[PDB]
Write a protein that binds this ligand. Structure first.
Ligand code: PEE
Ligand code: PEE
Ligand code: PEE
Ligand code: PEE
Ligand code: PEE
Ligand code: PEE
Ligand code: PEE
Ligand code: PEE
Ligand code: PEE
Ligand code: CL
Ligand code: CL
Ligand code: CL
Ligand code: CL
Ligand code: CL
Lengths: 312, 312, 312, 312, 312
């Protein structure tokens, strides 16, 4: 069929709305995430009678091949959405109700700085196709936009899901300048990360730090170097549960600082043994007593400085 | 071919039924699982008879393009099901028997607390589109629902497969539609996990604990640190089996407690050596004799408390 | 078109034959594999015949849509096969020759309880739809059953490919159906497993057993714990290819026994050192001399018992 | 629906242009990258010239069918592009307007002689085969060639996206064809590779070097060999990413040099101990004092020479 | 439509030809690779011929569904090729041209008997069925077989791409078929393997060999066991990318020999210590002095013998 003819020079406003259901498969290396959700639309279609009569006040059912369906394309999807219509219901005289379920691989930026304690925003951009009838503009209705409060997004909690009309700036053609933006606010749950990552590494570092209460060079060497090996193994373990991020990160800075501390500890042990052999035991004892207090305080101050630098 | 016309405004009850064939590929990171099964509806027609002659008592077999096949849609599937019709034989009495086969990827939430001893319940939802003549009521046929007793899911044993009628309760009550829920209770076989994971860790921990019968500081340091390295390697080895779970788990708590015990053992060894060097062998011996009984009892009590907290 | 007339009171026999072309991608975790083969059919239809008067060629071609073709459905397949009809020929007496070429992926159980030295059997099931007029039965033609010489599975050698000519009839959903069974026996090529897996483990164990010829406590501790670390590392190489079976296996039993032996060796070393420190060297010497012979004999007997248990 | 007739012998020209949207999934081992963009075309056909003087005022508009759209294909793609048409329009004189959106995966070789600090160039080739009755040649419309401001690649900086105006015509398969070239120049962001890789290995090497201030043989052996093990683990972690090339890169040369330095350090330690045992301590002291200064200077000189060779 | 008339004495002969565009993704464990190429056909049809008079100068250009096109299939492919027709032309005498571009995945065995320095041959098989009226055979058009200059494989270099002109005619399921063989010979780029695998192994072995110049039991144990631990990781790395074979390769034999050497070294160290403790130092000195020369010579001879056995 064909879209309705113009009635009174009033543009055909399409009241769009996304009813999110599922979010999963957040592949971070390619920065893609699949979405399973509904899509509700309503375009006022007066002057095209669809059984308007009091005796026929019943709700009429229409199929996909019954009325003109506006064509809306997602901008940032790898392929066209695989959409199946759930139902189409039209009032005897008034608007039209539409609902369909689709799946699509969406591409949105995913910042990973301050990774354990970060928030993310997901964007879906919508555009409409103008046809032989009057010009079509896009508007959002707040009655249909929302979730079912049973979203199966694990590891994150949804804070808001809103929309706003924004201009479209890409290959402008005096048209198609009424794109839509949908923002999904999510926040990572950071509780399990503490016992899973942070505490064991601190335990390993504190085990390495016990060499300042000993004077046995072999024992100190074994302690520090085997603790470094254990740290490398734990870094291998951690690296798996984390996407490949070719940029600086809070966790990477912490790891680098840990490596630096290991190097400084090795230097201190070597200096102490060298002085003891060269027969300056008072100087060696002074150095080790100073180190016992110096190391944790410097570690804590560096942690505070780095946290302030990264988290405003 | 159209849906049957109404007779006396009696709603038509469709006796649905799902017969499982294959269940496989229970992926937990994506929180999905593919299923291959049957589908049967027992809707009957009254006005539109199908050769109801006594002489032609032979069962009439029809192609899909011979009658009206109801459109049933699954709420929580990624894509539309592949409808592979099996057989459509309609008796001249009036009732219709239908069979088909589909292979759809189902989305269902999973819980991985008490991971080695966990049980899961998988859900399948159904919906039917109302027609403009009258309303279609969804019902459950008890005989049709069942399995073939050769459904093979690796690592799980299937217990029951039942169906109930529940209200839709969706925020988009287009037609006050109904819904169906199919539940598949399963359990995990946990016996192999004991020899595969639990016992080697206990052996490694006891090997670590053998340092309380020795006085050689270098030997004790080597034992404890190499045992810690072995524990880290075993954790890397066993990380490949657990799903990537963004919340706390019984096994994770056990591993964290093991790390804490290693740290405490290192501290105890350091204290013993420091006392011996400071020439307090009585205190050193008292502490090292106390530890031999202190460590296993505290470990057992912590295990009991953790088990009670996680399993009620 | 309509099925052949039921004037022939005897059941309509449909000869069947599957000729393999290649087999590939034998999956272990999902226990599925993909196939590519011909599908032959043959039956007699007196409704359409040929005469030499029309032509002396004695062979008549046809189109799939102009001839009643029985419908054959696979049972244990993830999706529908991709059928490619080749040619249809009609004998002058009414014998029809049908041919196709398909590809599909088959679901079949696997049993890795003798993993290095196990054998498997892959099944393909065929069913035929009943018809109102006549009765349909399935038969097996041995001359149409075979396999190419270029069929190969990476790591397996094919023994035989036969078909059970005995259908297992059953009544499902008030309908009678017939089934066929095609069996493909395979065996795993285990020769490479010996020098790649078994012998290095024996070498490492024999290296660790050398601690019974020395009295230096530190050297014994280093030997035993470092060999334990090496065993843990080698287990990763072993598990990088072994399928994740959630049940008991011969290899898992061997590995668990190895862990137990390591624990017992650590215990023996600790006991010897403790006895030597308390100025009782004769008992320590007796213990180590006894262990030197005790360990290999017990290991051999346990290996024999396990081999008898899992292969008897 | 048919090639336009030439006046006497003139060929036909089509003006193209690609507007990027986003680039992602740039593989290093596979040497492939994905893309999705807009494709614009324009060509002149005087057979369907519009006449606004008498027959209508508005210019012609069409649909994806019932109009000839020339065959435009990509040479270096794995599969045919997935495209959907967005707009078609026809000018009164005869020139046509076309637009579509596509997504494809492109094959292009990469050069890793300067892997941490390298820049690449990606090629996209278009082509069209001349039909019998009318040769076709391509052209570039600079007003349409460009990239979106949101075009971002993870870890790369985009510098330019231009097209070579001159086509490369050649006779292939007894037909004349024309080819366009699109070039995308990018540069890697190298900062994050410094603290993640470069510095930890230097720290480990210095920890290894620290053994020249010691005279205990066991401590030196422990230091050097454990640092070698740590280097091996780090090298495996690094090599998990970079692919293998027929030529020699920079990182591989650095790693090989580090291995050589470790071997020489082990040799020096063994020589020092052997000389000390034979009661010649002065030579051992001279050798170790020489090595203390010899090693870092040679390391620095070799690094400078490698930097000059690879980047000069 | 219809097969060409068998008025000509010879059977129907089709001239084929494949022109490679690019090859990629040569999987090693699955023994597969992907291809993108053209496909040209040519045969003789007595009908459809036309006279250059009556506008017959224009050579006819039909489309599929208007002529009889022979069915040609690839034997060793996982799925049917994704093909699109390019152009069909008919010469006035009666010969028919044909062109088509496709992409497919090919199955072909490999031979890793000389894995680092091996050469492979890849096969693509074309087959054709037979029709009732006439018989069909294949041929090779020499001037239509070739490859682009941009055909590159990652890790290999392409030598030649020819075709065996002699078909293999045989009867398969009561019909005669003809087959063609296309061979692609490639050689491996082995330069990257030497400085990444071979030399570090030799360095580690030489480092472990330094225990023959020492007399301290603990240092020797540490050296040998830590070198074995380092060797195991390289074994894992090498075995990751090399599949399992029923025969014995070169690298596996080298690795097994290295394991044997490590075991013998451990035995020698233990024997030396046992003799030294027993107050027999001269015999131990003789043993270690003999071993110093014995080990490298035996290693060199064994390497030479293995190289002669596998490559000669
Ligand atoms: C030194 C620091 C030791 C105390 C640190 C405790 C921090 C919390 C922690 O790691 O807990 C892990 C774990 C239990 O976690 P739950 O709180 O039961 O998790 C379920 C509820 N979310 O702690 C233990 O098992 C403690 C063992 C003693
Ligand atoms: C954070 C940095 C942690 C570094 C590692 C801690 C090492 C502690 C060793 C202290 C030690 O040996 O002291 C022995 C000392 C000697 O006794 P006198 O008072 O002289 O009689 O005895 C003690 O202090 C008894 C032990 C008390 C507990 C020691 C550890 C407590 C802190 C643990 C870390 C918490 C985080
Ligand atoms: C010497 C005796 C060795 C007996 C070994 C028996 C054996 O291997 O049985 C394994 C068997 C099941 O077979 P798998 O295939 O491993 O099943 C799980 C999948 N991996 O597992 C078990 O036995 C389960 C564990 C229960 C028994 C545990 C025995 C513990 C013994 C402790 C001895 C301590 C010695 C102290 C000396 C003082
Ligand atoms: C569980 C925790 C296990 C930690 C390790 C326990 C074994 C330490 C070694 C004990 C030791 O040296 O005892 C020597 C002691 C000396 O006897 P006198 O009184 O001097 O005569 O002899 C013995 O105890 C004999 C050997 C028995 C050791 C086996 C004990 C069982 C250990 C594993 C239990 C199962 C888990
Ligand atoms: C140790 C100190 C920290 C490591 C050195 C920091 C390197 C950053 C230097 C800037 C590199 C980029 C740049 O603009 O330099 C120019 C140039 C690249 O530009 P094109 O020639 O176009 O390519 O870069 C170079 O030549 C840099 C190469 C030498 C310096 C980097 C070497 C660092 C690692 C080697 C030493 C340690 C061994 C491990
Ligand atoms: C790049 C560097 C690569 C090599 C690094 C090896 C480690 C540095 C040397 C550690 C031991 C130095 C040492 O023993 O010096 C002690 C020596 C003793 O004093 P005298 O009275 O002269 O005797 O000097 C000191 O105490 C000075 C302090 C030494 C540490 C400062 C140097 C740190 C180097 C970082 C690089
Ligand atoms: C490659 C084959 C296997 C190599 C194993 C590693 C080689 C170890 C060599 C150690 C040499 C050693 O300890 O002896 C040093 C010995 C010192 O003894 P002198 O008193 O000078 O004369 C001997 C009579 N008293 O001689 C030397 O200093 C020679 C220098 C050793 C260079 C070794 C180079 C090895 C290169 C391998 C490639
Ligand atoms: C098969 C089971 C293998 C069990 C594990 C074996 C552990 C290693 C064997 C012991 C090595 C040390 C032997 C030793 O020190 O022998 C001393 C002994 C001293 O002799 P007398 O002074 O007369 O007494 O030295 C010798 O001459 C013994 C010869 C030993 C070398 C040959 C060893 C062969 C081992 C084969 C292991 C199985 C394959
Ligand atoms: C000293 C300790 C060992 C260090 C060196 C270990 C590695 C040695 C490997 C030698 C090697 O690969 O030689 C193989 C190589 C090839 O053998 P073919 O099979 O005949 O060649 C193929 C063409 N027909 O053999 C030779 O070239 C032998 C020539 C003498 C080698 C050096 C002897 C001195
Ligand atoms: Cl879309
Ligand atoms: Cl569905
Ligand atoms: Cl099927
Ligand atoms: Cl294309
Ligand atoms: Cl094909």
């Amino acid at each position: 069929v064909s879209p309705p003819p113009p009635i009174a020079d009033e543009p055909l406003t399409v009241n769009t709305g996304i009813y999110l259901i599922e979010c999963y498969s957040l592949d971070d290396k390619a920065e893609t995430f699949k979405v399973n959700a509904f899509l509700s639309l309503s375009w006022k279609d007066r002057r095209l009678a669809f059984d308007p009569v009091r005796s026929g006040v019943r709700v009429k059912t229409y199929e996909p091949e019954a009325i003109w369906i506006p064509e809306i394309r997602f901008v940032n999807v790898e392929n066209a959405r695989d959409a199946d219509v759930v139902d189409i219901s039209v009032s005897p005289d008034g608007t039209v109700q539409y609902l369909e379920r689709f799946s699509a691989r969406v591409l949105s930026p995913l910042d990973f700085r301050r990774y354990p304690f970060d928030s993310q925003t997901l964007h879906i951009y919508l555009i409409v196709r103008s046809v032989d009838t009057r010009n079509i503009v896009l508007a959002v209705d707040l009655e249909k936009v929302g979730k079912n409060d049973d979203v199966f997004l694990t590891g994150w909690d949804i804070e808001s899901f809103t929309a706003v009309v924004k201009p479209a700036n890409f290959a402008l053609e005096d048209r198609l300048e009424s794109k839509l933006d949908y923002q999904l606010r999510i926040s990572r749950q950071y509780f399990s990360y503490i016992p899973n990552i942070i505490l064991p590494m601190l335990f390993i570092l504190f085990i390495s730090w016990t060499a300042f209460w000993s004077t046995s060079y072999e024992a100190n060497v074994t302690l520090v170097v085997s603790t470094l090996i254990a740290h490398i193994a734990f870094n291998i373990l951690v690296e798996t549960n984390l996407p490949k991020t070719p940029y600086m990160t809070y966790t990477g800075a912490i790891i680098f600082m840990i490596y630096l501390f290991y190097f400084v500890a090795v230097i201190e042990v070597t200096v102490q043994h060298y002085l003891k052999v060269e027969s300056q035991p008072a100087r060696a004892a002074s150095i080790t007593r100073a180190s016992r207090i110096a190391f944790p305080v410097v570690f804590l101050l560096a942690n505070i400085i780095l946290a302030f630098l990264f988290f405003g």
